[PDB]
Amino acid sequence: CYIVTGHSTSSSAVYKRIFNPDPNRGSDRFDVNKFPQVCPVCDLLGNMGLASRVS
RNA sequence: AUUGAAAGUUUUUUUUUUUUUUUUUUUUUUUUUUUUUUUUUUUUUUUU
Structure with a gap:
């Protein structure tokens, strides 16, 4: 699962x-x-309020 | 209807004066407002 998306302000084809x-x-x-x-990547690295088993 | 009677025991005199229920007697002696709690996690200084 992508962590941050926001809006598209610039394009890089x-x-x-x-x-x-x-x-x-x-x-x-x-x-x-x-x-x-959560997604496995979020569980591994981190998420909002969930820390990182990694540093 | 008496031997036969007609007389207030009355007037007058303050139970009054002297004397602070008073003196002494601290509602104090002791008791830590402490005690467990990471200002922490998420984010690539970056493109036509």
């Missing part, structure tokens, strides 16, 4: 071609009792 874009995919929500399950 080289990035869009080298790496496959996926605008459909959303983002992880939180680590509170509401929606505690």
Whole structure:
């Protein structure tokens, strides 16, 4: 799950071609009792309010 | 209807004066407002 999306303010077609874009995919929500399950990457690295098993 | 009677025991006099329920007697002696809690996590100084 992508962590930060925001809005598209600049275009870099080289990035869009080298790496496959996926605008459909959303983002992880939180680590509170509401929606505690997260994407594996968010669980590994970190998320808002969930720390990083890694540094 | 008496031997036969008609007389207030009355007038007058303050139970009054002297004397602070008073002196001494600290509602104090002791008791730490402490005690467990990371201002922490998420974010590539960056493109036509």
